[PDB]
Amino acid sequence: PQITLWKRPLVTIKIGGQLKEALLDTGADDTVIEEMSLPGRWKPKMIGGIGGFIKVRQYDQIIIEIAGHKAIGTVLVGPTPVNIIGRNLLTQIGATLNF
Amino acid sequence: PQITLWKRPLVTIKIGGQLKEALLDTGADDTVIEEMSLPGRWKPKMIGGIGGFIKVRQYDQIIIEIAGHKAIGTVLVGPTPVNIIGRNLLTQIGATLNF
Ligand SMILES: CC(C)(C)NC(=O)[C@@H]1C[C@@H]2CCCC[C@@H]2CN1C[C@@H](O)[C@H](Cc1ccccc1)NC(=O)[C@H](CC(N)=O)NC(=O)c1ccc2ccccc2n1
Ligand SMILES: [Cl-]
């Protein structure tokens, strides 16, 4: 599978039993999802990007499916305008940047 | 070359005749470089990310070298925390995401 970048590399994910669209993002350390109820324990975190920081809820050991690939890892929930799959999960689904 | 994502995908770039380090970022539509003196005509623009928008200088038709590959395109210059190479130039150097 190879994804060119003339458009946003959006894929379908399954998280908390719901389908969402998310951006495959090699520039993001972390995976950040829009506000949603997720069951289970979490802890407060702040994460930064181009316009500054947002508060998120950090959930560890979340089961997620990304474009058909299974993953288990940390998901941050908070007011991102776009759902983002960052390197912590891109490494699990085997993504590489070929240039 | 193929980049795994266990670490940040940082590469050397050449802009304005100066070497810098920048992040290869499939989640960014645009290329944003830290404040620097750069010759060329520009115009103001807002660009956004997590945390909101920042004001930048939009330079069109800038010659940039990214990991040894020459590209020409729009560069935004402003108070970004990190230099980022986004899809407008990743496509020009032929970068793909594979998995
Ligand atoms: C998600 C998080 C874990 C916080 N990581 C990061 O944000 C790190 C931070 C690094 C240090 C500072 C400079 C940016 C780098 C790159 N990144 C990721 C990097 O990939 C980040 C991910 C992202 C995408 C969409 C919207 C928000 C955020 N992209 C961006 O910050 C780019 C900047 C640009 N080109 O205009 N934003 C966008 O391309 C973009 C697209 C759609 C939008 C819709 C509404 C509002 C904003 C929107 N921004
Ligand atoms: Cl919900």
Whether A97 and B97 lie within 8 Å, measured CB to CB: yes
Ligand nearest to the CA of A54: 1
Computed on alpha carbons and rounded to an integer, the radius of gyration of chain B in Å comes to 13
Give the Cα-Cα-Cα angle B4, B7, B12 (nearest 5 degrees).
85
CA-CA distance, B72 to B79, in Å (whole number)? 22
Computed on alpha carbons and rounded to an integer, the radius of gyration of chain A in Å comes to 13
CA-CA distance, A32 to A35, in Å (whole number)? 9
Q: Which residue has the tokens 């941050």?
A: A76
Contact B46, A50 (CB under 8 A): no
Token pair, residue A81, equals 């305008």
Residues of A in contact with B81 (CB under 8 A): 48-50
Q: Which residue has the tokens 């085997």?
A: A94
Contact B5, A26 (CB under 8 A): yes
- Complete domains list, chain A, with CATH: 1-99 (2.40.70.10)
Q: Which residue has the tokens 């992040």?
A: B23
Give CA separation, B39 vs A33, B42, B83, B84, B87, in Å: 39, 9, 18, 19, 23
Alpha helices in chain B (DSSP H): 87-90
Q: Which helix (H) or strand (E) holds A87?
A: helix A87-93
Token pair, residue B7, equals 């670490």
Q: Which helix (H) or strand (E) holds A89?
A: helix A87-93
Token pair, residue B58, equals 């939009």
Token pair, residue A93, equals 């689904």
Token pair, residue B61, equals 């038709």
Ligand nearest to the CA of A20: 2
PDB resolution in Å? 1.4
CA-CA distance, B63 to B46, in Å (whole number)? 22
- Pick from B70, B72, B48: which is nearest to B60 by CA? B72
CA-CA distance, B66 to A69, in Å (whole number)? 31
User: Residue B23's beta-bridge partner residues?
Assistant: B10, B84
Contact A99, B96 (CB under 8 A): yes
- CA-CA-CA-CA torsion for A82, A41, A17, A87, nearest 10 degrees? 40
Quick one: closest CA in B to A10, which residue?
A: B27
